[PDB]
Design a protein around this ligand. Sequence first.
Ligand SMILES: *[C@@H]1O[C@H](CO)[C@@H](O)[C@H](O)[C@H]1NC(C)=O
Ligand SMILES: *[C@@H]1O[C@H](CO)[C@@H](O)[C@H](O)[C@H]1NC(C)=O
Ligand SMILES: *[C@@H]1O[C@H](CO)[C@@H](O)[C@H](O)[C@H]1NC(C)=O
Ligand SMILES: *[C@@H]1O[C@H](CO)[C@@H](O)[C@H](O)[C@H]1NC(C)=O
Lengths: 98, 594
Amino acid sequence: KVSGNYNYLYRLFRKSNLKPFERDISTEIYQAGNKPCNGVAGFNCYFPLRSYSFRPTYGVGHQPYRVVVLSFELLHAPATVCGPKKSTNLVKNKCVNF
Amino acid sequence: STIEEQAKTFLDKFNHEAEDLFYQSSLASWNYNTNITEENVQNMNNAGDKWSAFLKEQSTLAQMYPLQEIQNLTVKLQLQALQQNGSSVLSEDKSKRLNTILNTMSTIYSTGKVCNPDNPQECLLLEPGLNEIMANSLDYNERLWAWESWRSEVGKQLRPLYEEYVVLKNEMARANHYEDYGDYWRGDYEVNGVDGYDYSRGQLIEDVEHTFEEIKPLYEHLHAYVRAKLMNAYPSYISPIGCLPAHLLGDMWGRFWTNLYSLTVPFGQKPNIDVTDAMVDQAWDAQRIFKEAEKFFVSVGLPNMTQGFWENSMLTDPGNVQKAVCHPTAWDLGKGDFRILMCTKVTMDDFLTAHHEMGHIQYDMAYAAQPFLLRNGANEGFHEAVGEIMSLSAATPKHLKSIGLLSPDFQEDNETEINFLLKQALTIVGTLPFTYMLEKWRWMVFKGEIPKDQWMKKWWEMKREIVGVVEPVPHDETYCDPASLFHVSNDYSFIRYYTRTLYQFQFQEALCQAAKHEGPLHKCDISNSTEAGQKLFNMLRLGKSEPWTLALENVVGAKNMNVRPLLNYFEPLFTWLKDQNKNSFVGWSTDWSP
Ligand SMILES: *[C@@H]1O[C@H](CO)[C@@H](O)[C@H](O)[C@H]1NC(C)=O
Ligand SMILES: *[C@@H]1O[C@H](CO)[C@@H](O)[C@H](O)[C@H]1NC(C)=O
Ligand SMILES: *[C@@H]1O[C@H](CO)[C@@H](O)[C@H](O)[C@H]1NC(C)=O
Ligand SMILES: *[C@@H]1O[C@H](CO)[C@@H](O)[C@H](O)[C@H]1NC(C)=O
C-alpha cells in the first residue's frame, strides 16, 4: 500500500531454537536479563514481534515478498502425487511396440 | 548474565525504530520539497516532535549503560554514540535561553537588511546582488562603504549573541564534563581501543596546524602572482607596496577567487576547453548528464546505481507551477530511496558538482547496508570528499575531451595545464587559509582564553601574515567579520571543511599514484581505471564500524591528515609559481598598511 502494508507482524525473539516443522505463537518477552520483569515491559524487556517497513517507493531488498515451499515424504506411505507421463502416437493397422 | 545481550537488543530496537521514524520524517521533508503547503509544514513539524521525543527517550534509556566492562568494539562505539544527546543534562532555563538566542540570531541574520542608500525600496538584496556589486565594480568608495556599513547594523546582534552562545555551550560542556562544544564537534571522530593509536582531540588541531604551515608557501606564491597581476591591470588606487584591503575580497568574507581570476588572467590569446557548442549540438540535458555519469561510473569500474535514481528521483526542477529552493540536494530517503533534486543546469563546473552529488548518492547506497548507528562514516568529512573525488577526477581536460565535449584536435598543451592548476589553486587554497583563521579563532573563543575584544589584533595579525587582507579603517567594538560567514552562525564545526578537503586530496593522490597514470601528473583520471574503482568501493562502505586512521593510511599512506597530496597534485602548480615568482620581490610587509 502507498501508505504502508503493516497488517501482519514478524516475530523476532524466541528463547529456544526450533526444529523442522515447528511454529511459534507465544509473544512472551525474551527475558535474558535476570532483573524482575513480567507482563508489561520495562528494564530490558523488548516485545518479540517487531513492526514492518513496506511501501512502494522503497528501493532494493525491502519490498514485500512471498515465499512458498513444496515438501513431501519419501515412499513410506504409498506414492500418491505425480504428474503426467509423456505419450506419443498410437498408430492403427501398422506394426509398433505397444 | 551481563547486560551484553540487553545492550544488543537495545541497539537493535533503536536501529529499527530509528529507521522507521526517521524514514517518516524524511518522507515529510521530501513531501515538502515536492509540494509546499502549510499542512505539509504542520506534518513535518509533528514528525520532528515525535522524533525529538523518541531521541530523548532513547538517550534516557542509554544513559545508565556503562562502557568500561563491555569490551566489544562495535558495541562500545554504538553505545557511546547513543548515550550522547547534547544539551539535555543541563537545567531547562539554559536550554530555553539557548533556543531563544539561536532563534533570534537566525532571524537577525536572515532578515538583516543592507543595500544601496540611494534606492532602498526595490534594489539588489543580500544575495546575490551584493556579490555582483562587490566583485564586479570599478570604483571602491561605494564598495568599502557597503562593506563597512554591513556590520554597523547587523554585527550588533552578531558579537554579543555569539558571546551568549559560547558561554552557554561552555557551561553545557562543563555539565557534560568537557571544556567546549567544538570539542564535542570534533568528538564524532573519536575512536579508542587500538594500541598505539590513542586518539585525543588536540591531535586534530596540531595536524591542521602542520598542514597549513606546509600550505603557506603555496599561498605566498599565489598572492605574489595575484598582487603582481593586479598591479599590472588595476593601477587605480592600490599602491605598488600596499596590500589587498577589505573592499577587494570578492565575497562576503573572501572564500572563492575564480571571480577575481579575471584580474589574474595570464594568457587570453590561447584557446582553452569550452563545451557550449558541444552542449548545444547534441542537446545535452540533465537526462543526458546523468546517462554520461552512469557511463563514467561504468568506466571507473564502480557497480550500477540503483533504480531510485531512474524512477523515484525527479530528474528536473519542479517547473514553474510551484516554487522551492534549488540548492544541491542529494537525499537518502531510506531503505533504498536515493534522489537528487536541484535546478538542473549544464556547465563543466556544474558537471563536476553534479558528479559530486552523485558520489554522495553512491556513498549513501554503500552505507545503506549498515544499521542506523552505522549509517554514516567514521568522520563527517567522508561524504563530501568521496563525492568530490570523481569531480576532481573530472576537473582535468582529458576525459572531457574523451566524452567528446570538444574536438580531439584541440591542443592539450602546457597552457591549459598551468591555467587549470591555478584554477584549482584559487578554488581550494584561496579559501583554506581563511578556514585556518576562522577555525583557530573559534577554538580559542570556545575554550575562552581570548578576550572577546582582543580579536581585533591577533585575528587581524593573521590577516596581516597569512592571507594579506587589511581594512582602510580598523574595526570597532561590534565588527565581527568572522561572524559574517554564513556557516559559523549555523552551528557548524568549521574544521570539518578542512578535514574534508584533506580527505578528498589524499584520496585523489591515492587514485592518481596507484592507478599507473603518467604524463602530466594532473592528467590522471579514474575513468578506465578498474583497480581505482575497486579500491575506492572497498573503502566507502563500512562507515564507522572500524577506526578511520588505519584505513586512511592503507588507501593513501598517511597516518592522519596531510597536505602532501594537495601539493602533489599541485607540483605542476608549484613549479609554475616558482617559474613566475622570480621576476621581483614576493611577499608583503606587516608594518606597512593603508
Ligand atoms: C501541489 O498540491 C496542489 C493541491 O494540493 C496541486 O494543485 C499542485 O498541482 C501540486 N503540485 C505539485 C508539484 O505536486
Ligand atoms: C563483538 O561481538 C560479535 C558477536 O556477534 C563478534 O562477531 C565481534 O568480533 C565482536 N567484536 C570484536 C571487536 O571482536
Ligand atoms: C545494473 O547495471 C547495468 C549495466 O550498467 C544496467 O543496465 C542496469 O540498469 C543496472 N541496474 C539498475 C537497477 O540500475
Ligand atoms: C576506457 O574505456 C572506455 C570504453 O570501455 C573508453 O570509452 C574510454 O575512452 C577509455 N579510457 C580512455 C582514457 O580512453
